[PDB]
Amino acid sequence: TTTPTTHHLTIPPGLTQPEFQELAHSISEFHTYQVGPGQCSSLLAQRVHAPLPTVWSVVRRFDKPQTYKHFIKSCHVEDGFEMRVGCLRDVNVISGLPAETSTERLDILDDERHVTGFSIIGGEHRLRNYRSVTTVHEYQNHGEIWTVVLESYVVDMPEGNTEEDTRLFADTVVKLNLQKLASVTEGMAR
Amino acid sequence: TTTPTTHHLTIPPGLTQPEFQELAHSISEFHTYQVGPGQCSSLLAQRVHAPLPTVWSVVRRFDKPQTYKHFIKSCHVEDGFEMRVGCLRDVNVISGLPAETSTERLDILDDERHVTGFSIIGGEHRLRNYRSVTTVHEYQNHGEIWTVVLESYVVDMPEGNTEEDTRLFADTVVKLNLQKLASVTEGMARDQ
């Protein structure tokens, strides 16, 4: 009943067959979670027609998630802020209800392998123990080069929610943010 | 006591002044709301590079809001469903909350003037007493023709929310839905 996710065995929506083949080892390396009862996890993918550094330059800005995410009113980092593993950010999210600032922790930041990740340690009460990972990759199709962004998460389902509904919400939000990420970065690359 | 919105006095973001000249009359005719305390209102615009009938044909399908809106799991209408003013739809919303369903009422449907509108009569915790209006318009400049969609709303701010935060939420949903509407309809027209 507690088993590793299998995101590396299913073509995620947003990828083609060749893209997925070339990326499955990275999916198993960076986008694997332990899912038990009362947890769910998902992988989303987005093609981005901008150079990988341009795309990574946004993905890595732990202090400015609003650069590519919707529903962010503001994001503040701490005084002695160095974008280093463990630093905390307070994200005020636009939810339509009055909400508590979301306290998030930088879990991973690898400028050579283009991997970052975070976990929500305070604020969001319903989607508890959210932890997410983003990787950025370059891909080739008969000479044509583009960037692929993979974002996954694991979360505890609130008592009284199904896996299908919790995943539907988190997937919908991630998918919209990845759309914004592509628009923002393809414009920077023009 | 309420006061009127004056959305016809502001160029909606993304539109130009000549577009606005042609549309200001429609904003005051169809997009004027009475705003009291604890309510706020907004008008959004989306340029669409597809024929007006293609855009209107999607916007008018009160029974299929998921064709152009995000965050809808499904939409249920009654069996012998008739799309006439007063008809009801039940929108099961993707919220992360359990079984949120918005019962919405068709307020307006004018296939000659391309105006539709609805209000939420129960079930949406974020958008209480939401009432919205969409108009679709044609425009031509130096020969080039495109469609302009205007969507506005009025909504109650939940107790403990500012108008700024309530409009930020509702504006974001509207603008993302208008983005989807444009993608959906520009794709239908390229397949033509």
Q: Where are the domains of chain B?
A: 3-190
Chain A with chain B: Cβ pairs closer than 8 A: 51
Resolution (A): 2.1
* Rg, C-alpha atoms of chain B: 16
Rounded to whole angstroms, the maximal C-alpha distance in chain B is: 51
Q: For residue A23, how many other CB atoms are within 10 A of its CB?
A: 20
Provide the experimental method for this PDB entry.
Answer: X-ray
Place domain B3-190 in its CATH homologous superfamily: START domain (3.30.530.20)
For B65-70, the CB contacts below 8 A with 24+ separation are B65/B89, B65/B91, B67/B184, B68/B177, B68/B180, B68/B181, B68/B184, B68/B185, B69/B177, B69/B180, B70/A172, B70/A176, B70/B94, B70/B173, B70/B176, B70/B177, B70/B180
Burial class (CB in 10 A: 0-12, 13-18, 19+), A60: buried
Q: For residue B80, how many other CB atoms are within 10 A of its CB?
A: 5
Under a CB-based contact definition with an 8 Å cutoff, are residues A39 and A31 in contact?
Answer: no
- Token pair for A177: 């943010």
Provide the CA A29 distance to its chain's centre, in angstroms.
15
Nearest by CB to residue B168, choosing from A73, A98, A176, is A73
Nearest CA to B127 out of B189, B169, B160 is that of: B169
Q: Chain B: give the shortest CA distance to residue A183, in Å.
A: 12
- Token pair for A188: 């920077």
Nearest by CB to residue B94, choosing from A97, A158, A172, is A172
In angstroms, the Cα distances linking A27 to A5, A136, A139 are 10, 11, 15
Instruction: Give the best residue of A172, A173, A178 to mutate against chain B (max B CB count within 10 A).
Output: A172
Which residues of chain B lie closer than 8 angstroms to A96, CB-CB?
Answer: 125-127, 158, 166, 169-170
Q: What is the CATH number of domain A3-189?
A: 3.30.530.20
Under a CB-based contact definition with an 8 Å cutoff, are residues B29 and B43 in contact?
Answer: no
Under a CB-based contact definition with an 8 Å cutoff, are residues B54 and B185 in contact?
Answer: yes
Q: For residue B19, how many other CB atoms are within 10 A of its CB?
A: 19
Pairing state of beta strands B88-93 and B72-76? antiparallel
DSSP state letters, B61-91? -TT-GGGT-SSEEEEE--TT---STT-EEEE
3-state class percentages of chain B: helix first, strand second, coil last, to nearest 5: 30, 35, 35
Nearest CA to A129 out of A161, A159, A157 is that of: A157
